UniProtKB/Swiss-Prot annotation:
The active site is at S61 (acyl-ester intermediate). The lineage of its organism: Bacteria, Pseudomonadati, Pseudomonadota, Gammaproteobacteria, Enterobacterales. It comes from Escherichia coli (strain K12). Inhibited by the beta-lactamase-blocking agents avibactam, enmetazobactam, relebactam, nacubactam, vaborbactam, taniborbactam, zidebactam, and beta-lactam-analog boronic acids, via a covalent binding to Ser-61. Inhibited by non-beta-lactam, benzo(b)thiophene-2-boronic acid (BZBTH2B) and various cyclic boronates. Not inhibited by clavulanic acid. Inhibited by O-aryloxycarbonyl hydroxamates, via cross-linking of the active site Ser-61 to Lys-312. Weakly inhibited by citric acid. The class C beta-lactamase family has a specific amino-acid numbering system known as SANC, for structural alignment-based numbering of class C beta-lactamases, or else the simpler name structural position. A multiple sequence alignment was used to derive a consensus sequence and then the consensus was numbered taking into account insertions and deletions. This allows use of identical numbers, e.g. for active site residues, despite differences in protein length. The keyword Hydrolase applies. This is Beta-lactamase. Changing Y147E: Lowers activity more than 1000-fold.
Length: 358
């Protein structure tokens, strides 16, 4: 690999792994469109299995970017509109607070205070209907952003209804397959189990627990190679041959709302490049990222801006992921680790690497 990339990546990631006690990590840098890969440490500490370019990691909320793109593809297909009331796709949702809450609100966490988690107590489909029917918004729709699995998770489930496909079926056939993401999974198959890293939480090996709307909000697992290809696809959607998918990727990077210096896409979040690193670094801390913030509607949404830092953090109990890219520069990074370590450390390392390469 070019020595510049080798040095920049190793000088940043090595101390990060040491400081954060990360058991295993994979990184891809996309530079001028081509991927370069780096691996450290262990997928499975007990069985002494190293991290490789084929290791599967839990993406956590990086999964929201796939959900956003799949939703975008459904809009491009003419199956849904972001302006369509939620109740159009879930007629049983008759409670009055849902009047005026659209698919856009669900996709972008602006429905008016849907909670971060779906309660663990929600096990059945009737439990899910009950939860949404009884939910009381704190705010009018489209006025405040509150990051939430229960918001974009519902969006994903409703977005695929017109297709008649399950969420998993829709994701596989409309996103994973056309992009040749052949080691990316919502449910890790037995054939790929030997590659599935353990996550580590307080020293214990863990995998993500089953839960309501898990697939839609945080349930994707992938390898560093497939994630590099995901970044390439989002960097350059015009190279994608499937028209609705190309369009969906573009829609997911449109700017729908602004809060402070960040813009909300579908799954993706974006800031103007050049960024103030303190802004993205401090902004990624869950103390800010998960806060209720007033939003300004972008009316109409700005189409994907090439001079953007586009990114998403993801976590599960045992895993911590980060993806960031800058379309204008054909530059990006994926960092996948089997420990959920603090977001600002992820973003700081990412910015150090991309800034040195740009
Ligand atoms: B995203 O990364 O912001 C979502 N993160 S998460 O921690 O909410 C994902 C999640 C939800 C429920 C259970 C688990 C788990 O690891 O068992 C993870």
């Amino acid at each position: 690999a070019p020595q510049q990339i080798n040095d920049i990546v190793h000088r940043t990631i090595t101390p990060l792994i040491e400081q954060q006690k990360i058991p295993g990590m994979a990184v891809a840098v996309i530079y001028q469109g081509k991927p370069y890969y780096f691996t450290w440490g262990y997928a499975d500490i007990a069985k002494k299995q190293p991290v490789t370019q084929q290791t599967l990691f839990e993406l956590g909320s990086v999964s929201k970017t796939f959900t956003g793109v799949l939703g975008g593809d459904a809009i491009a297909r003419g199956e849904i509109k972001l302006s369509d009331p939620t109740t159009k796709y879930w007629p049983e949702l008759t409670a009055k607070q849902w009047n005026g809450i659209t698919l856009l609100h669900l996709a972008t966490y602006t429905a008016g205070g849907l909670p971060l988690q779906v309660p663990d107590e929600v096990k059945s489909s009737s439990d899910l209907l009950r939860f949404y029917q009884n939910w009381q918004p704190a705010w009018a729709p489209g006025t405040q952003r509150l990051y939430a699995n229960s918001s974009i998770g519902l969006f994903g489930a409703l977005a695929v209804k017109p297709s008649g496909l399950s969420f998993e079926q829709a994701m596989q056939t409309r996103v994973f397959q056309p992009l040749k993401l052949n080691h990316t999974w919502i449910n890790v198959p037995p054939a790929e189990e030997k590659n599935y890293a353990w996550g580590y939480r307080e020293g214990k090996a863990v995998h993500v627990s089953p839960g309501a709307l898990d697939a839609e909000a945080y349930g994707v697992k992938s390898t560093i190679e497939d994630m590099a290809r995901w970044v390439q696809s989002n960097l350059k959607p015009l190279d994608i041959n499937e028209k609705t998918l190309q369009q969906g990727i573009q829609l997911a990077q449109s700017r729908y709302w602004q809060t402070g210096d960040m813009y909300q896409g579908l799954g993706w979040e974006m800031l103007d490049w050049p960024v103030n690193p303190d802004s993205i670094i401090n902004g990624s801390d869950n103390k800010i990222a998960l806060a209720a913030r007033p939003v300004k509607a972008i009316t109409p949404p700005t189409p994907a801006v090439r001079a953007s830092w586009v990114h998403k953090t993801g976590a599960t109990g045992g895993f911590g992921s980060y993806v960031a890219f800058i379309p204008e520069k054909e530059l990006g990074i994926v960092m996948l680790a089997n420990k959920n370590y603090p977001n600002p450390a992820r973003v700081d390392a990412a910015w150090q690497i991309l800034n040195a390469l740009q």
